[PDB]
Amino acid sequence: MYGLVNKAIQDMISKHHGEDTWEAIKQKAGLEDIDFFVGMEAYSDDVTYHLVGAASEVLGKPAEELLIAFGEYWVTYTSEEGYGELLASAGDSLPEFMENLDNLHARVGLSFPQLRPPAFECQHTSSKSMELHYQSTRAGLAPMVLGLLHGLGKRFQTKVEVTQTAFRETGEDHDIFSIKYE
Amino acid sequence: MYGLVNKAIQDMISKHHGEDTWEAIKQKAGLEDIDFFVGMEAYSDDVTYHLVGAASEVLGKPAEELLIAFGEYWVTYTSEEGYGELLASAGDSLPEFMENLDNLHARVGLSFPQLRPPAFECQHTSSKSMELHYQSTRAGLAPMVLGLLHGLGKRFQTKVEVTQTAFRETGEDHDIFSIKYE
Ligand code: HEM
Ligand code: HEM
Numbered sequence: 315m316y317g318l319v320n321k322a323i324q325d326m327i328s329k330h331h332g333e334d335t336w337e338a339i340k341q342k343a344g345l346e347d348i349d350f351f352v353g354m355e356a357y358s359d360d361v362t363y364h365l366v367g368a369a370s371e372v373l374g375k376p377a378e379e380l381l382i383a384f385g386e387y388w389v390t391y392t393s394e395e396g397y398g399e400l401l402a403s404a405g406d407s408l409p410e411f412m413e414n415l416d417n418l419h420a421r422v423g424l425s426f427p428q429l430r431p432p433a434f435e436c437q438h439t440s441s442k443s444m445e446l447h448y449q450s451t452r453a454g455l456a457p458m459v460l461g462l463l464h465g466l467g468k469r470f471q472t473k474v475e476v477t478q479t480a481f482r483e484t485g486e487d488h489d490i491f492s493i494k495y496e
Numbered sequence: 497m498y499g500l501v502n503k504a505i506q507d508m509i510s511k512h513h514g515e516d517t518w519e520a521i522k523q524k525a526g527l528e529d530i531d532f533f534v535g536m537e538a539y540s541d542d543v544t545y546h547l548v549g550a551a552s553e554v555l556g557k558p559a560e561e562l563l564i565a566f567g568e569y570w571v572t573y574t575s576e577e578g579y580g581e582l583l584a585s586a587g588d589s590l591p592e593f594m595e596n597l598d599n600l601h602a603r604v605g606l607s608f609p610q611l612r613p614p615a616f617e618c619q620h621t622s623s624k625s626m627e628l629h630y631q632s633t634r635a636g637l638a639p640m641v642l643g644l645l646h647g648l649g650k651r652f653q654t655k656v657e658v659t660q661t662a663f664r665e666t667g668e669d670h671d672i673f674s675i676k677y678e
Contacts, residue, residue, distance in 0.1 A: 375621075376661065378661040378662075378674075379661065379674050382659050382661075382674060439556065439557045439558065439561060440557070443557065443561055445558060445561075457659065457661065460659045460660075461659070464657045464659070467657075473646070473655070475564050475642055475643065475646055475658070476642075476659070477560050477561075477564060477638070477639040477642055477660065478660065478663070479558060479560045479639075481663070481665075481666055483666070484666055492558050492560045492561040492564070492639070494561060494564055494565065
Protein backbone atom coordinates (compact mmCIF):
# COMPACT_ATOMS: atom_id res chain seq x y z
CA MET A 315 0.00 0.00 0.00
CA TYR A 316 1.08 3.65 -0.35
CA GLY A 317 3.65 4.73 2.20
CA LEU A 318 1.15 6.94 3.99
CA VAL A 319 -0.40 3.81 5.47
CA ASN A 320 2.86 2.62 6.88
CA LYS A 321 3.85 6.06 8.26
CA ALA A 322 0.57 6.12 10.10
CA ILE A 323 1.26 2.71 11.69
CA GLN A 324 4.65 4.03 12.69
CA ASP A 325 3.15 7.20 14.10
CA MET A 326 0.58 5.21 16.06
CA ILE A 327 3.18 2.88 17.59
CA SER A 328 5.66 5.64 18.42
CA LYS A 329 3.04 7.92 19.91
CA HIS A 330 1.66 5.08 22.05
CA HIS A 331 4.75 3.01 22.93
CA GLY A 332 7.82 5.15 22.18
CA GLU A 333 10.44 5.03 19.45
CA ASP A 334 12.52 2.19 20.90
CA THR A 335 9.47 -0.06 20.62
CA TRP A 336 8.83 1.21 17.11
CA GLU A 337 12.43 0.45 16.12
CA ALA A 338 12.19 -2.99 17.74
CA ILE A 339 9.08 -3.66 15.64
CA LYS A 340 10.66 -2.28 12.51
CA GLN A 341 13.74 -4.44 13.08
CA LYS A 342 11.60 -7.54 13.69
CA ALA A 343 9.66 -6.95 10.45
CA GLY A 344 13.00 -7.02 8.62
CA LEU A 345 12.65 -3.36 7.57
CA GLU A 346 15.53 -1.67 9.41
CA ASP A 347 17.08 -0.69 6.06
CA ILE A 348 14.15 1.71 5.56
CA ASP A 349 15.01 5.05 7.17
CA PHE A 350 11.59 6.63 6.65
CA PHE A 351 8.47 5.72 4.72
CA VAL A 352 7.69 7.85 1.68
CA GLY A 353 4.08 8.95 1.92
CA MET A 354 3.14 9.03 -1.74
CA GLU A 355 5.20 6.05 -2.90
CA ALA A 356 3.79 2.53 -3.35
CA TYR A 357 5.19 -0.22 -1.17
CA SER A 358 4.57 -3.94 -1.27
CA ASP A 359 1.57 -4.92 0.83
CA ASP A 360 4.01 -7.24 2.65
CA VAL A 361 5.62 -4.29 4.36
CA THR A 362 2.30 -3.58 6.10
CA TYR A 363 1.50 -7.21 6.98
CA HIS A 364 5.04 -7.73 8.32
CA LEU A 365 4.78 -4.62 10.45
CA VAL A 366 1.52 -5.72 12.00
CA GLY A 367 2.89 -9.26 12.48
CA ALA A 368 6.04 -7.91 14.04
CA ALA A 369 4.05 -5.59 16.29
CA SER A 370 1.76 -8.38 17.49
CA GLU A 371 4.86 -10.20 18.76
CA VAL A 372 6.59 -7.27 20.39
CA LEU A 373 3.51 -5.79 22.00
CA GLY A 374 1.90 -9.11 22.96
CA LYS A 375 -1.42 -8.25 21.33
CA PRO A 376 -3.08 -10.18 18.56
CA ALA A 377 -2.78 -8.81 15.05
CA GLU A 378 -6.51 -8.28 14.81
CA GLU A 379 -6.42 -5.96 17.76
CA LEU A 380 -3.62 -3.85 16.32
CA LEU A 381 -5.61 -3.57 13.10
CA ILE A 382 -8.76 -2.47 14.94
CA ALA A 383 -6.71 0.12 16.75
CA PHE A 384 -4.98 1.34 13.62
CA GLY A 385 -8.35 1.68 11.94
CA GLU A 386 -9.68 3.94 14.69
CA TYR A 387 -6.42 5.90 14.78
CA TRP A 388 -6.54 6.54 11.03
CA VAL A 389 -9.65 8.63 11.30
CA THR A 390 -7.85 11.00 13.63
CA TYR A 391 -4.51 10.85 11.86
CA THR A 392 -6.04 11.86 8.48
CA SER A 393 -7.91 14.80 10.01
CA GLU A 394 -4.59 16.02 11.39
CA GLU A 395 -1.94 15.23 8.78
CA GLY A 396 -3.29 16.78 5.60
CA TYR A 397 -6.61 15.16 4.76
CA GLY A 398 -8.97 16.98 7.17
CA GLU A 399 -10.95 18.89 4.56
CA LEU A 400 -11.21 15.89 2.31
CA LEU A 401 -12.49 13.97 5.32
CA ALA A 402 -14.94 16.72 6.24
CA SER A 403 -16.16 16.92 2.66
CA ALA A 404 -17.21 13.26 2.76
CA GLY A 405 -20.11 13.84 5.12
CA ASP A 406 -21.36 14.53 8.58
CA SER A 407 -23.02 11.32 9.52
CA LEU A 408 -21.89 7.70 9.46
CA PRO A 409 -24.26 6.51 6.78
CA GLU A 410 -23.58 9.46 4.49
CA PHE A 411 -19.85 9.04 4.98
CA MET A 412 -19.95 5.40 3.92
CA GLU A 413 -22.04 6.20 0.86
CA ASN A 414 -19.35 8.74 -0.09
CA LEU A 415 -16.33 6.55 0.67
CA ASP A 416 -15.71 5.13 -2.82
CA ASN A 417 -15.66 8.75 -4.06
CA LEU A 418 -13.42 9.91 -1.24
CA HIS A 419 -10.96 7.18 -2.23
CA ALA A 420 -11.26 8.10 -5.95
CA ARG A 421 -10.26 11.71 -5.19
CA VAL A 422 -7.30 10.44 -3.20
CA GLY A 423 -6.64 8.28 -6.25
CA LEU A 424 -6.24 11.19 -8.67
CA SER A 425 -3.20 12.05 -6.58
CA PHE A 426 -2.11 8.44 -5.88
CA PRO A 427 -2.16 7.04 -9.44
CA GLN A 428 -1.52 3.35 -8.50
CA LEU A 429 -4.13 3.32 -5.69
CA ARG A 430 -6.08 0.09 -5.19
CA PRO A 431 -8.83 1.36 -2.94
CA PRO A 432 -11.47 -0.92 -1.49
CA ALA A 433 -15.12 -0.62 -2.45
CA PHE A 434 -17.98 -0.07 -0.08
CA GLU A 435 -21.65 -0.51 -0.82
CA CYS A 436 -24.42 0.34 1.64
CA GLN A 437 -27.83 -1.30 1.77
CA HIS A 438 -29.82 0.72 4.31
CA THR A 439 -32.18 -1.51 6.26
CA SER A 440 -33.59 1.49 8.11
CA SER A 441 -32.76 5.06 9.12
CA LYS A 442 -30.51 3.67 11.90
CA SER A 443 -29.08 0.51 10.38
CA MET A 444 -27.37 -0.82 7.31
CA GLU A 445 -25.84 -3.82 5.64
CA LEU A 446 -22.32 -2.87 4.58
CA HIS A 447 -20.51 -4.68 1.77
CA TYR A 448 -16.69 -4.42 1.87
CA GLN A 449 -14.94 -5.45 -1.37
CA SER A 450 -11.18 -5.58 -1.53
CA THR A 451 -8.31 -6.75 -3.72
CA ARG A 452 -6.66 -7.68 -0.42
CA ALA A 453 -7.15 -10.20 2.39
CA GLY A 454 -7.11 -9.83 6.13
CA LEU A 455 -8.21 -6.18 6.68
CA ALA A 456 -11.76 -6.67 7.98
CA PRO A 457 -10.69 -5.88 11.52
CA MET A 458 -9.26 -2.57 10.31
CA VAL A 459 -12.64 -1.77 8.78
CA LEU A 460 -14.16 -2.46 12.18
CA GLY A 461 -11.79 0.03 13.79
CA LEU A 462 -12.46 2.58 11.07
CA LEU A 463 -16.20 2.39 11.72
CA HIS A 464 -15.66 3.04 15.43
CA GLY A 465 -13.41 6.02 14.59
CA LEU A 466 -16.16 7.39 12.39
CA GLY A 467 -18.62 6.77 15.25
CA LYS A 468 -16.36 8.91 17.43
CA ARG A 469 -15.98 11.61 14.76
CA PHE A 470 -19.77 11.95 14.48
CA GLN A 471 -20.64 11.38 18.16
CA THR A 472 -22.49 8.26 17.10
CA LYS A 473 -22.71 4.87 18.80
CA VAL A 474 -22.12 2.11 16.29
CA GLU A 475 -22.74 -1.60 16.74
CA VAL A 476 -21.06 -3.75 14.06
CA THR A 477 -21.15 -7.46 13.40
CA GLN A 478 -19.51 -9.31 10.53
CA THR A 479 -21.93 -11.67 8.82
CA ALA A 480 -19.87 -12.86 5.83
CA PHE A 481 -16.20 -13.75 5.52
CA ARG A 482 -13.95 -13.35 2.46
CA GLU A 483 -11.31 -15.42 4.35
CA THR A 484 -13.41 -18.54 4.08
CA GLY A 485 -14.05 -18.24 0.35
CA GLU A 486 -17.22 -16.11 0.47
CA ASP A 487 -17.33 -13.44 -2.21
CA HIS A 488 -16.74 -10.61 0.28
CA ASP A 489 -16.90 -9.34 3.87
CA ILE A 490 -20.40 -8.15 4.86
CA PHE A 491 -21.32 -6.32 8.04
CA SER A 492 -24.58 -5.50 9.72
CA ILE A 493 -24.46 -2.14 11.37
CA LYS A 494 -26.67 -0.30 13.82
CA TYR A 495 -25.90 3.29 14.62
CA GLU A 496 -27.07 5.89 17.16
CA MET B 497 -34.23 -21.97 25.33
CA TYR B 498 -36.56 -21.09 28.22
CA GLY B 499 -39.80 -19.41 27.23
CA LEU B 500 -38.75 -16.12 28.78
CA VAL B 501 -36.38 -15.59 25.82
CA ASN B 502 -39.17 -16.05 23.37
CA LYS B 503 -41.57 -13.84 25.34
CA ALA B 504 -38.96 -11.12 25.29
CA ILE B 505 -38.63 -11.35 21.50
CA GLN B 506 -42.39 -11.16 21.22
CA ASP B 507 -42.51 -8.17 23.51
CA MET B 508 -39.77 -6.37 21.60
CA ILE B 509 -41.49 -6.87 18.24
CA SER B 510 -44.99 -6.06 19.50
CA LYS B 511 -43.83 -2.92 21.26
CA HIS B 512 -41.86 -1.70 18.24
CA HIS B 513 -43.95 -2.86 15.25
CA GLY B 514 -47.38 -3.75 16.65
CA GLU B 515 -49.31 -6.95 17.25
CA ASP B 516 -50.31 -7.56 13.62
CA THR B 517 -46.61 -7.72 12.74
CA TRP B 518 -45.93 -10.02 15.69
CA GLU B 519 -48.73 -12.37 14.56
CA ALA B 520 -47.38 -12.30 11.01
CA ILE B 521 -43.92 -13.28 12.28
CA LYS B 522 -45.33 -15.91 14.58
CA GLN B 523 -47.39 -17.27 11.71
CA LYS B 524 -44.36 -17.26 9.38
CA ALA B 525 -42.24 -19.14 11.94
CA GLY B 526 -44.81 -21.96 11.95
CA LEU B 527 -45.78 -21.22 15.56
CA GLU B 528 -49.39 -20.12 15.24
CA ASP B 529 -50.31 -23.22 17.35
CA ILE B 530 -48.64 -21.64 20.41
CA ASP B 531 -51.07 -19.35 22.23
CA PHE B 532 -48.48 -17.78 24.52
CA PHE B 533 -44.93 -18.58 25.57
CA VAL B 534 -44.48 -20.02 29.05
CA GLY B 535 -41.68 -18.13 30.73
CA MET B 536 -40.23 -20.84 32.92
CA GLU B 537 -40.75 -23.73 30.50
CA ALA B 538 -38.05 -25.05 28.17
CA TYR B 539 -38.62 -24.86 24.44
CA SER B 540 -36.62 -26.24 21.52
CA ASP B 541 -33.92 -23.75 20.46
CA ASP B 542 -35.52 -23.99 17.03
CA VAL B 543 -38.47 -21.98 18.23
CA THR B 544 -36.17 -19.02 18.82
CA TYR B 545 -34.20 -19.47 15.58
CA HIS B 546 -37.41 -19.77 13.55
CA LEU B 547 -38.81 -16.66 15.18
CA VAL B 548 -35.73 -14.65 14.33
CA GLY B 549 -35.65 -16.08 10.77
CA ALA B 550 -39.30 -15.21 10.33
CA ALA B 551 -38.82 -11.73 11.77
CA SER B 552 -35.92 -11.10 9.38
CA GLU B 553 -38.22 -11.81 6.42
CA VAL B 554 -41.19 -9.80 7.60
CA LEU B 555 -39.16 -6.80 8.74
CA GLY B 556 -36.60 -6.79 5.90
CA LYS B 557 -33.67 -6.74 8.29
CA PRO B 558 -30.96 -9.34 8.57
CA ALA B 559 -31.19 -11.77 11.46
CA GLU B 560 -27.89 -10.63 12.93
CA GLU B 561 -29.20 -7.11 13.16
CA LEU B 562 -32.33 -8.18 15.01
CA LEU B 563 -30.19 -10.22 17.38
CA ILE B 564 -28.18 -7.09 18.15
CA ALA B 565 -31.34 -5.17 18.91
CA PHE B 566 -32.76 -7.98 21.00
CA GLY B 567 -29.59 -8.14 23.04
CA GLU B 568 -29.85 -4.46 23.92
CA TYR B 569 -33.57 -4.75 24.61
CA TRP B 570 -32.99 -7.63 26.99
CA VAL B 571 -31.06 -5.47 29.41
CA THR B 572 -34.06 -3.20 29.79
CA TYR B 573 -36.62 -5.98 29.66
CA THR B 574 -35.00 -7.94 32.51
CA SER B 575 -34.79 -4.88 34.78
CA GLU B 576 -38.49 -4.35 34.27
CA GLU B 577 -40.05 -7.81 34.22
CA GLY B 578 -38.80 -9.50 37.38
CA TYR B 579 -35.00 -9.60 37.31
CA GLY B 580 -34.09 -6.00 38.22
CA GLU B 581 -32.58 -6.76 41.63
CA LEU B 582 -30.72 -9.76 40.30
CA LEU B 583 -29.40 -7.50 37.56
CA ALA B 584 -28.49 -4.77 40.05
CA SER B 585 -26.71 -7.32 42.24
CA ALA B 586 -24.36 -8.31 39.41
CA GLY B 587 -22.46 -5.04 39.56
CA ASP B 588 -22.22 -1.38 38.76
CA SER B 589 -19.72 -1.34 35.98
CA LEU B 590 -19.40 -3.14 32.69
CA PRO B 591 -16.24 -5.00 33.57
CA GLU B 592 -17.56 -6.05 36.98
CA PHE B 593 -20.86 -7.14 35.50
CA MET B 594 -19.18 -9.37 32.94
CA GLU B 595 -16.92 -10.98 35.62
CA ASN B 596 -20.11 -11.77 37.55
CA LEU B 597 -22.11 -13.07 34.53
CA ASP B 598 -21.51 -16.81 35.03
CA ASN B 599 -22.69 -16.38 38.65
CA LEU B 600 -25.67 -14.34 37.54
CA HIS B 601 -26.62 -17.15 35.17
CA ALA B 602 -25.98 -19.81 37.87
CA ARG B 603 -28.40 -18.02 40.14
CA VAL B 604 -30.96 -17.96 37.35
CA GLY B 605 -30.32 -21.69 36.85
CA LEU B 606 -31.41 -22.65 40.39
CA SER B 607 -34.87 -21.56 39.31
CA PHE B 608 -34.42 -22.87 35.74
CA PRO B 609 -33.18 -26.44 36.40
CA GLN B 610 -32.48 -27.25 32.69
CA LEU B 611 -30.65 -23.96 31.93
CA ARG B 612 -27.76 -24.20 29.46
CA PRO B 613 -26.21 -20.82 30.12
CA PRO B 614 -23.23 -19.57 28.12
CA ALA B 615 -19.84 -19.03 29.73
CA PHE B 616 -17.88 -15.85 29.82
CA GLU B 617 -14.23 -15.32 30.58
CA CYS B 618 -12.70 -11.84 30.92
CA GLN B 619 -9.07 -10.99 30.27
CA HIS B 620 -8.64 -7.35 31.30
CA THR B 621 -6.04 -5.75 29.04
CA SER B 622 -6.16 -2.48 30.96
CA SER B 623 -8.40 -0.32 33.14
CA LYS B 624 -10.31 0.64 29.96
CA SER B 625 -10.25 -2.51 27.85
CA MET B 626 -10.86 -6.21 27.94
CA GLU B 627 -10.85 -9.34 25.82
CA LEU B 628 -14.10 -11.24 26.33
CA HIS B 629 -14.33 -14.98 25.64
CA TYR B 630 -17.89 -16.19 24.89
CA GLN B 631 -18.43 -19.94 25.10
CA SER B 632 -21.72 -21.45 24.14
CA THR B 633 -23.40 -24.79 23.46
CA ARG B 634 -25.25 -22.87 20.74
CA ALA B 635 -24.46 -21.18 17.42
CA GLY B 636 -25.46 -17.83 15.97
CA LEU B 637 -25.82 -15.67 19.14
CA ALA B 638 -22.57 -13.68 19.14
CA PRO B 639 -24.40 -10.73 17.63
CA MET B 640 -26.84 -10.86 20.54
CA VAL B 641 -23.86 -10.66 22.86
CA LEU B 642 -22.78 -7.50 21.04
CA GLY B 643 -26.18 -5.92 21.70
CA LEU B 644 -26.14 -7.03 25.33
CA LEU B 645 -22.81 -5.31 25.83
CA HIS B 646 -24.19 -2.08 24.41
CA GLY B 647 -27.24 -2.40 26.67
CA LEU B 648 -24.93 -2.72 29.69
CA GLY B 649 -22.98 0.34 28.43
CA LYS B 650 -26.29 2.21 28.52
CA ARG B 651 -27.18 0.85 32.01
CA PHE B 652 -23.85 2.03 33.42
CA GLN B 653 -23.62 5.25 31.37
CA THR B 654 -20.49 3.93 29.74
CA LYS B 655 -19.36 4.33 26.16
CA VAL B 656 -18.48 0.91 24.86
CA GLU B 657 -16.78 -0.18 21.65
CA VAL B 658 -17.00 -3.89 20.83
CA THR B 659 -15.30 -5.71 18.00
CA GLN B 660 -15.40 -9.46 17.43
CA THR B 661 -11.95 -10.88 16.73
CA ALA B 662 -12.66 -14.64 16.60
CA PHE B 663 -15.73 -16.38 15.22
CA ARG B 664 -17.12 -19.78 16.21
CA GLU B 665 -19.13 -19.58 12.93
CA THR B 666 -15.95 -20.04 10.89
CA GLY B 667 -14.56 -23.00 12.86
CA GLU B 668 -12.71 -21.13 15.61
CA ASP B 669 -13.04 -22.71 19.04
CA HIS B 670 -15.13 -19.80 20.34
CA ASP B 671 -16.19 -16.18 19.84
CA ILE B 672 -13.75 -13.58 21.25
CA PHE B 673 -14.54 -9.87 21.50
CA SER B 674 -12.15 -6.97 22.19
CA ILE B 675 -13.90 -4.27 24.19
CA LYS B 676 -12.97 -0.66 24.90
CA TYR B 677 -15.00 1.20 27.48
CA GLU B 678 -15.18 4.65 29.15
C1 HEM C 1 -12.14 7.11 7.07
C2 HEM C 1 -12.83 6.13 6.51
C3 HEM C 1 -12.14 5.22 5.61
C4 HEM C 1 -12.33 3.88 5.52
C5 HEM C 1 -13.48 3.11 6.20
C6 HEM C 1 -11.32 3.42 4.61
C7 HEM C 1 -11.17 2.10 4.23
C8 HEM C 1 -10.05 1.66 3.57
C9 HEM C 1 -9.61 0.32 3.60
C10 HEM C 1 -10.35 -0.83 4.21
C11 HEM C 1 -8.42 0.24 2.95
C12 HEM C 1 -7.60 -1.01 2.82
C13 HEM C 1 -7.33 -1.35 1.37
C14 HEM C 1 -8.13 -2.54 0.92
O1 HEM C 1 -9.08 -2.94 1.62
O2 HEM C 1 -7.93 -3.07 -0.21
C15 HEM C 1 -8.05 1.56 2.62
C16 HEM C 1 -6.93 1.88 1.89
C17 HEM C 1 -6.62 3.20 1.62
N1 HEM C 1 -7.30 4.34 1.98
FE1 HEM C 1 -8.88 4.39 3.02
N2 HEM C 1 -10.56 4.46 4.20
C18 HEM C 1 -10.90 5.56 4.87
C19 HEM C 1 -10.54 6.88 4.66
C20 HEM C 1 -9.45 7.27 3.92
C21 HEM C 1 -8.91 8.58 3.86
C22 HEM C 1 -9.43 9.88 4.44
C23 HEM C 1 -7.85 8.51 2.98
C24 HEM C 1 -6.92 9.61 2.72
C25 HEM C 1 -5.63 9.35 2.54
C26 HEM C 1 -7.65 7.16 2.63
C27 HEM C 1 -6.68 6.72 1.78
C28 HEM C 1 -6.48 5.36 1.65
C29 HEM C 1 -5.27 4.88 1.01
C30 HEM C 1 -4.14 5.70 0.46
C31 HEM C 1 -5.34 3.54 0.99
C32 HEM C 1 -4.26 2.58 0.52
C33 HEM C 1 -4.69 1.89 -0.79
C34 HEM C 1 -3.53 1.44 -1.65
O3 HEM C 1 -2.33 1.65 -1.35
O4 HEM C 1 -3.80 0.82 -2.70
N3 HEM C 1 -8.68 6.44 3.18
N4 HEM C 1 -9.08 2.42 2.97
C1 HEM D 1 -31.07 -10.75 34.63
C2 HEM D 1 -30.34 -10.86 33.53
C3 HEM D 1 -30.31 -12.12 32.76
C4 HEM D 1 -31.09 -13.23 32.88
C5 HEM D 1 -32.34 -13.40 33.73
C6 HEM D 1 -30.57 -14.18 31.96
C7 HEM D 1 -31.16 -15.43 31.75
C8 HEM D 1 -30.81 -16.23 30.68
C9 HEM D 1 -31.61 -17.30 30.19
C10 HEM D 1 -32.85 -17.90 30.83
C11 HEM D 1 -31.00 -17.82 29.11
C12 HEM D 1 -31.52 -18.99 28.29
C13 HEM D 1 -30.67 -20.24 28.58
C14 HEM D 1 -31.38 -21.54 28.29
O1 HEM D 1 -32.59 -21.54 27.94
O2 HEM D 1 -30.73 -22.62 28.38
C15 HEM D 1 -29.86 -17.00 28.86
C16 HEM D 1 -29.12 -17.09 27.72
C17 HEM D 1 -28.14 -16.16 27.44
N1 HEM D 1 -27.58 -15.27 28.29
FE1 HEM D 1 -28.48 -14.52 29.78
N2 HEM D 1 -29.44 -13.70 31.42
C18 HEM D 1 -29.29 -12.42 31.75
C19 HEM D 1 -28.29 -11.50 31.40
C20 HEM D 1 -27.34 -11.74 30.42
C21 HEM D 1 -26.37 -10.81 29.98
C22 HEM D 1 -26.25 -9.35 30.39
C23 HEM D 1 -25.66 -11.43 28.97
C24 HEM D 1 -24.52 -10.92 28.18
C25 HEM D 1 -23.78 -9.93 28.60
C26 HEM D 1 -26.17 -12.76 28.86
C27 HEM D 1 -25.81 -13.60 27.88
C28 HEM D 1 -26.59 -14.71 27.58
C29 HEM D 1 -26.37 -15.42 26.33
C30 HEM D 1 -25.35 -15.06 25.28
C31 HEM D 1 -27.28 -16.40 26.28
C32 HEM D 1 -27.55 -17.25 25.04
C33 HEM D 1 -27.51 -18.76 25.23
C34 HEM D 1 -26.21 -19.36 24.73
O3 HEM D 1 -25.29 -18.59 24.34
O4 HEM D 1 -25.97 -20.59 24.92
N3 HEM D 1 -27.20 -12.92 29.74
N4 HEM D 1 -29.71 -16.06 29.86
